[PDB]
Structure formats: C-alpha cells, structure tokens
Design a protein around this nucleic acid. Structure first.
Lengths: 121, 131
RNA sequence: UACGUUCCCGGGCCUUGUACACACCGCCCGUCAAGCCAUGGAAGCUGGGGGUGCCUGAAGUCGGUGACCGCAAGGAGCUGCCUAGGGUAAAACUGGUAACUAGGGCUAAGUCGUAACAAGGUAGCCGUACCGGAAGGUGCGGCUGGAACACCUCCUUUCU
RNA sequence: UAGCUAGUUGGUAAGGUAACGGCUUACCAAGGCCACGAUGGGUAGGGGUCCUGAGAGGGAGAUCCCCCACACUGGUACUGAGACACGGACCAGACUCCUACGGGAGGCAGCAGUGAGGAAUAUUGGUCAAUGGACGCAAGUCUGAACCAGCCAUGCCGCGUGCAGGAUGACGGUCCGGAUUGUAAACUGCUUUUGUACGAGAAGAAACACUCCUAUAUAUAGGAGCUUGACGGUAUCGUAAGAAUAAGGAUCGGCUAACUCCGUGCCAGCAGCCGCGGUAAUACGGAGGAUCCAAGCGUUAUCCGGAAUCACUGGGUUUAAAGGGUCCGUAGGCGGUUUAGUAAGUCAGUGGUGAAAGCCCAUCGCUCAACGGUGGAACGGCCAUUGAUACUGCUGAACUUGAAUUACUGGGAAGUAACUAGAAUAUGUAGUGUAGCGGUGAAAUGCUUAGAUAUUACAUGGAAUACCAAUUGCGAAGGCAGGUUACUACCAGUUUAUUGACGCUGAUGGACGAAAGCGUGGGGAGCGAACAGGAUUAGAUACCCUGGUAGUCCACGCCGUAAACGAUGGAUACUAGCUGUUGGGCGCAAGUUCAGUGGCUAAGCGAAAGUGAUAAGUAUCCCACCUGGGGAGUACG
RNA sequence: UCGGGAGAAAGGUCGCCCUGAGCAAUCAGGGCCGCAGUGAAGAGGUCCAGGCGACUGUUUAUCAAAAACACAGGGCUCUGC
C-alpha cells in the first residue's frame, strides 16, 4: 500500500512449512518396526494396504507404507524409511526402501527393477 | 493541493478522454516549462499565458487528427511523486515507449527531455513521461 | 347428474426463489453410543542451562609484617585483596511425565429429532439475556443479504 | 520482552598501560540509554563468495583467500620484541594408565588410523626432487607445510563399446496368408582410438657450495664440467595378431515424448495432481514395440523459478479475505503563488580506495574441452575536493485563491435542565342492569349470580406522543417527533472588513457510543425473558391461548458490544445530460448560481450483478485491513 | 479485598588500641587478645496444605474458651403518634 506504511512495517514473508518433518531433514532414516498391520483407504478405493509403525533413530514414531508385494517385516526388523506420503491412508506419510539392510526386494519383477530393489535377471 | 504537476497532467488527460478543445489550468513556472516542452515536442497545438489573475492561467489547445481523431496523447503519467522522489544520473534514464515517447527530466541546467539530457551527460530528476 | 373449479390428484405455459443437478425419493444440522489421531487443564513426580545474595576458598600476580637465615640486597615463615572450584537459600525461564477432565478431526454412516436451503412449512441473520436431551425457543434493539401484495380520504389559496 | 544501569553518567586529583580512557582508587553532582526498539530470550563465526532469477530479489557461508575465537573443562602468571601460549608451566575438576599404596604420567578441533553415532565420506603410503618455513657464513638438519601415490563413477569435461555393402533369412509379439522388429541379422572388405605384448622415452632442474681471469671495491657480473627426480620407466612415440577387450536405467491415460496383447476382477496393486482395478484394464503384473538420457538412469532430503502466492519494480478491500462504530488529536508523513541567500538531498568532473581469488569478454598453452596464463570490464559502495541551482529541505520577504475570524439575512425531531396538555389502557368509588365475558382453525385454561362483560360521572397513577409526517430536516456517529421557557452548540448564503499557508491525514491516546446486561435508591399503567396452566402433535422443554417475575421508566454510576450497513475511510482537483425536492442569493416572471438530499442514464470502470458528477470514472497524500477452508477468534500469557 | 502476606524466607558487623574524614554521633584504614566480642540476664522458631469460623471481642466463678454466642452486613413483617 502506502510507501510510508511499507517503510514502517514491510511485507511479511512466511516460512513455507515443510512436508516431511519427522525425519530430521535427511534423505533416508533407519528405524525399527513395532507393529506391522493393514489399513483401509478413505474412499472410494477398496484395498488392504500394508503399513508398519516405525521408530526412527531420532525417537520419532511414524507410519510407513510397504510398497509392492512380498516381504518379511516381522515384529522387529531394521528398515530404511525414505519419505513420500499417500493420498489413501490418513496418517501414513512415509515409505520404506525395498532392498535396504534387512527388508526384502521383489521376485518376478522385470519392468521397474531400479525401484522395489530387484536385481537384473 | 498535493501535487500541482499531477493535477496539471490529470486535467489534460481528462480533457483528452472527454474530447475537449481547450483547458484553462492554473499557472506556475514549472507548469509553464512543461507546457513549453510539450509544445516544442508537438503534443499540443498552442498555449496562451492569460494574465488578470492573482496566479495566472494557462490556456492549452489539444491536438487531434483531421480524420479519425485519435488523440496523440495516449498516456501521460508521473514517475516522481511527493511520497517517493526518484532521481537518476545520466545513465539510468527511462526508455519510455522504446524511444518513441518523451520523459521530462528536471536537470541542473533546466527542464529537458530524457533524450536531450543524455547528450549533455547530465542527470536530474524524472518528473513525468508522455507516450 | 355437471350449480362450479375455492379444495384432492396429474399435466402445460409465464414470472419468481433456491445452499438441488442421479436433480425434494435432494441437500444438510446437532447431541448421545463404539474405535483411531493430535493438541489443552490439572493434585503431584522428575530434570536442563544461566542469574543473583551469602560462606569457604587451590594456584598465581600485587601489598603488610618479618624477633629467623644473610655482610647489603634479598629470602624463609605468617598475613591481606582479587579470583576458578565447592556448599547453601529463595526465585525466574524451560523440557518430560501424571490419576482425572474439556474440546477438535476422521471411521461403518448406529440411536434420537428435522434446525437452515422454496414464504423450508413460525422469514432469515447480528448483538445481548434467560431456558431446554439436541439441532434450538423466547424477550429488546438493528439489517435485507426475504418472498407475495404494493400510487390518495378531504382539492386550492384573501394580512392571520 | 517497556523499562534498564549504581563505577552506572560527567567532573576534580592520584595509581597506572606501549598509548588516551572509570582501566582502578579517593571526593562532588545525578546523571546516561530507551518506541528511530534499551533490556531480556532464541539462533548464529563475519566477508570476498556459491545456487537460482530477465532484473529487482530470494536461499546458503563445504573446498580457495582475508579477519576473529578455541585447543579436555576453567583460572593465573613467567620467559620472550611479540603469548595470559595446540604439540610450554602452575592450580582445581571429570576420565584412562603405572604403583612397592607413599606417589605419579597423560590430552589427535595436527597427518595416517580405532571404537561409537549416522542414510552417508578414504592409505596406520612415498619424498624433501621443486616452492615456502626454522636454524647455520656455508656445507647441511628438520618440515604428515608442500609435491606425489592409493580408495570412492561424488561433480565437470573428452573418448570408446566399430565403418561401408548386403535380403525382406530363421525366431518372437500382432491381425484374419499379411504387417512388425528389419540392413536389423547371416555373410563380404577396411581401421586399430581404447585393451594386451615388445622396443624407445621426457618437461617439471633453476640453483646452492668448491677451484679459475676482468673491473671496481670488499657489492655486483659472465662462463666450465663429475653435479642435484618420490612420481617413474609416468606422460608420449613406434612395431605385431585381432571387431575382437566394453550399455544400461527410466517412461508410454492427460499434464508430457512414446501403444498392442495376455493374466487378476474394487482383489493384487499403482499414484507428483486429476485419479485407475467390482471379470473385454492404452493407468495393476508379464511379453512385444516405441520415446528420453547415456557410463549413467530414477527416488528421497534441502533451496530458487514458475508464485504478480507479501506485488518498490509488480495486487487488492460493495457482493469472493479485507474500511477501524464515529470524531478530536500527539509523534510522524505530505506541502498554494512569487522572490533573495546557502548548497543538505540531487547531478557532473578529479584524486584515493573498493586485496587477491571467483563470474563475464577477448586472446594464448595443455591434440579439443574441463584446466591454466594475460588483459579489460565489473566490484552498483565510501572519503576529500571543484562546479551547476532546474526540483526537494533551511533561512528571510511579499500575495490571496486554501484556511480561519468578523458583519447582515436565515435554518432546523441538534443537545442539557425545568414546567405543562389531550386521547387511550389499568384500578378505585358511586348510579343502572342481568348471564354471560374473553379467546381460537375449532376448543379449553381464565373472570363471572360474592353481580362480570356493558354504560354514565369523578378520582388516582405510569409510559408514549394519532393528524402534521415524508427516499423531509439536523447531528461526527449512536441517534433525534405533543407544547413552552432558560442555558448552549452548529450550519448555509451574501455588498462587507480582517490575518496571511495559520492546511490534509493521523500509529500510541482521549471522548462519545443502539439494544441487551451489572450496582445502589425510587416508580411500576401497558408489554413481557424465565416460569405456571389450556390447546396441537407419535412426542412439543416451540409456534397458538390465559396469567405472570426480572426488564422496559427515573437519579448517579459500570461494560463497550451490533446486519454500529451506503457490507463503499478521510481530503483536493478534473470529466455528458434528463428529472424532483430542502434551505439561501439574483430575479416584476421566466429562469440562473452556491450548499445538502433521491431516481433514469452516456462515456468510463467491474468477473458479472451493478456503479455512474453525492462514482465503484482519471490522478496525488495519509491511516486501517487482506494473503486457501476447517481447527479458531480456539489454546497460553 | 491492592491495605497486606512480611519481622516472609535466607544472610553480614558488633571486643580493645591508634590514625584520618567527620555534625555529637558515625565511617574508613591498620594493630592486639580469646574457644567464644548483642562474651552474664531480657527480647519471634520457620515453612507447606486442608476443615470450621470473615475479622477484634464474649461464654459454663470452681474439670469444657470452642467449629459455641455476639458482630458489621442482608431479609421478612408490625407500628401514623
């Protein structure tokens, strides 16, 4: 508006709140799972999505989504969370890297092998 | 008032929009200098300095074409304002209408145009610009 | 037998209002009951830095004394100020946690009512006060961001 | 986060330090900072610079260079020109080690390495051969500085995984014999960049020190050879078999470049957004084909752009988020005309500086490039000095148009206080008189034979003022209505006279501020929250009916909220008309001109509805407010 | 309840001699003595939380001093001389 008003109090710039916050601004974070279960999407989708409660190394409890099919993910397993939410499960805001320290990859996968951690046949 | 120069430009703009013939603005040294510059550049037909007032009047005749009138003054605006004064040396003069318009610049010598002052290499304060 | 279209049902045209458009057999509101999530209050519990007020205060520089070593200097020995560290007392900031408790967002769309959207069937809303399982009701003032209706009792003049 | 500081602020004399100084002490005074942000809390080494962006800007401070701070955590001093000292000392504290138990030794934020932490970052390597540093006359010694080497596709640049001819060959996916991969393949000639083997083979080295003649003077200068390489037999060149020794990742519904079939049937799953899968999926998995990039390809995390999505460049506030409820006014912001002086802002020149490095431009050497050398530009900045005076600021003077005062005509429900009138409702007394009155869509509750309703006369008390009366008028807004008086205030027009910019807006702040509500003391006719009965309904804590407390009223106060609305802040100046009305002036009438108040509409604005001279039209100044919805005007103070 | 809480809590000095600044007082420097210097006696223990009663006050002389009574304040009702 007025130049005098701008000189008195200028324009306020906001901070642009981040997307992935509970991983300490790191690309990947190691964690241990405590409860691997299945949830439902909101609507109108109908499925049984596989999620796991992961406790990261910085003391943060998050819900991660297991991509693909075929995994072990016992009650205690070392997983590597990377990030990336889903628009179906309310609360799950992270993903697990397939091919990490303890998590399994995929078998019979030939198209998207860089993802899902699959070796070249 | 708050800006006699802004009023002088606004009266001309309103008369051009309303398709008038003459304007009877109040007078002052700066307004007379601007009127002389505009008449030398060819944006107005004629001007008369009318006496018999405590301040004096300036009667300006606006110019239109003899067919498809199309007033030659399309946009006459200000750059310096009483709330923000903008000065510039002889390197930051504007480029009004890509060299096709005029920019009045009050210089240390007098009132000149943005192109007539860059040759003299003097700066000053940009007052207004006309297309 | 039919005086007739004021009512009941269905259909057509014009205008009008709409928060409906799979189009009122629409949309939508609130409480209670069952789960999941994050955030407040609270008798208490447990910490973290820094500040201030006292006491004690190592080494060290700088003063006093120095009856003892030395021929003079000077030194030994006592002692004073300053100050790390330690102890103590009351507060300030801030983190975690806690029986219980208030409200918020979703879940399958469970129970109860139909408050708003048409004049929504008592026009709606705003401020305020009281009351009620709940949407809400009523009193006072204000607005149209409301629909339908929407020209008039006196007819004409002297300075009283 | 609104007060902070007590040697704190200034002074007078000493002690002092390299040096001025509350740096310290003794005395006197109460000063000093603070809304232009003291103090307090959180975070953080600063800059040259890097990324991004058309630019203005925004985000970071690795590697290179400059400045500052630190050396296990703290304090102190000595030596020394220089330290309150990384690899020096003393003391205290926490760790680890030795011990004969009395006492002692330690500090990788140096290089290479170990444990732990983490998603994640390397050799316990070679040499002083060059440059630098310390010591020495020198020879020379030391140098984890430095130069090399190893590991990591981490990033930039360059090359290769062959080049020509060759048919529509098998094999696959697809259609109902054709098309597709496809000159692709088999096969035919050629080159070894790269890889292996052998033979040659560097620059980085200029010097230092010792013996020789020259001149001048103990200073400089020339020439000689046995001289001086970790890299390293490294770069580089030549010779001989041999296409041999070397291509993968993502995507194919739209955004966005690329489509067919098979299997699953809202399952498995996919997903940056829209969203796909419930049995004919170009969106899931597989196969074929196609597109992009290429020794790389995708995902994640942190930034800039797109985002004009904080807008100075470069947005808005009637209805989408947004004008404060309204005025007064402090700090502040802006400034009618002319004139004289200075030159603070502004402009121009000169000198100094703006380190080097980095970006850009030009030119040279590594076979090109990356890289390196040289030059220019840039570093938008600051200091001193010399000029111009058009515009802003300051000082002086002048003027009336802005503004204010005065004089004359008027104007109003404009305020405060005090009196007074009528109609109507309620109650009471008296007279008459008998069976109903009241109410609803219909009823009932209710008052009545204890005489109601009805009517006449009188009396009492409270509140509000029919007609006038209205898109009237006044007030900053809220608001103001029977009549009269007193005390004030304000506004409009005009022949005056007068001062001369005395003006506009206005954060903090002050005042006023509907109704409802709160405290104290009166009053209480009607109305009537809550409440009690009757009625409707499946239910009716409501609509309807009968009663009724607070309240509505008055005298002092308290809060400061509204759909406090024109959902439109206050000024000034311009830009077409038509048509009413209010109060003035000029008019014998017509009609004209100011100050307010409504309607139609042109241009112009607006997404449209609409606005439109009383703008939401074109400009300038000041204030407030807006930045997706909910949570939320919620939590805390 | 803005008056309080509050002497909250928690701490420091006190003897004798000399010198100086001083308004008598007192203060500032030194020195000396003892285990101890307001050297004897007299002079508040404090804090945290709950019940009752607002408070000061009064009460069973001779077993009960209280949460009992009273109290300022609030209310209803009677009373026209």
């Amino acid at each position: 508006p007025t130049i005098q008003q701008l000189v008195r109090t200028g324009r306020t710039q906001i901070t642009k709140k981040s997307k992935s916050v509970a991983l300490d601004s790191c690309p990947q974070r190691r964690g241990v799972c405590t409860r691997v279960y299945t949830t439902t999407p909101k609507k109108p989708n109908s499925a049984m999505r596989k999620v796991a409660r992961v406790r990261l190394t910085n003391g943060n409890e998050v819900n991660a989504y297991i991509p693909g099919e075929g995994h072990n993910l016992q009650e205690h397993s070392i997983v590597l969370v990377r990030g990336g939410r889903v628009k179906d499960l309310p609360g799950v805001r992270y993903h697990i890297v397939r091919g990490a320290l303890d998590t399994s990859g995929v078998a019979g996968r030939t198209q998207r092998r860089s993802k899902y951690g699959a070796k070249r046949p | 008032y708050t800006d006699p120069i802004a009023d002088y430009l606004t009266r001309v703009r309103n008369a051009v929009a309303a398709n008038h013939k003459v304007v009877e603005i109040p007078a002052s040294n700066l307004k007379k200098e601007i009127t002389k510059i505009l008449f030398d550049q060819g944006y107005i037909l004629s001007y008369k300095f009318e006496q018999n007032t405590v301040q004096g009047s300036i009667k300006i005749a606006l110019k239109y074409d003899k067919d498809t009138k199309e007033p030659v003054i399309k946009d006459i605006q200000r750059i310096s304002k009483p709330g923000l004064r903008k000065y510039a040396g002889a390197a930051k003069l504007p480029r009004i209408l890509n060299g096709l318009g005029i920019a009045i610049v009050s210089t240390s010598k007098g009132l000149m145009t943005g192109k007539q002052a860059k040759q003299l290499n003097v700066g000053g304060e940009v007052i207004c610009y006309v297309y």
